[PDB]
Amino acid sequence: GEPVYGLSEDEGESRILRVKVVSGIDLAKKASDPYVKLSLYVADENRELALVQTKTIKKTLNPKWNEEFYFRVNPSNHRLLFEVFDENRLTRDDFLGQVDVPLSHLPTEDPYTFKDFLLRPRSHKSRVKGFLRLKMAYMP
State the Cα–Cα distance between residues 67 and 70, nearest whole angstrom.
Answer: 10
Fold classification of 1-140 (topology level) = Immunoglobulin-like (2.60.40)
User: Domain coordinates of the chain in residue numbers?
Assistant: 1-140
The experimental technique behind this entry is X-ray
Please spell the DSSP secondary structure of the chain, one letter per residue: ---EES--S-TTT-EEEEEEEEEEES-------EEEEEEEEETTTTEEEEEEEPPPPSS-SS-EEEEEEEEEE-TTTEEEEEEEEE--SSSPPEEEEEEEEE-TT--B------EEEEPB-SSTTS----EEEEEEEE--
> What's the reported resolution, in angstroms, to a tenth?
1.9
Residues pairing with 117 in the sheet: 132
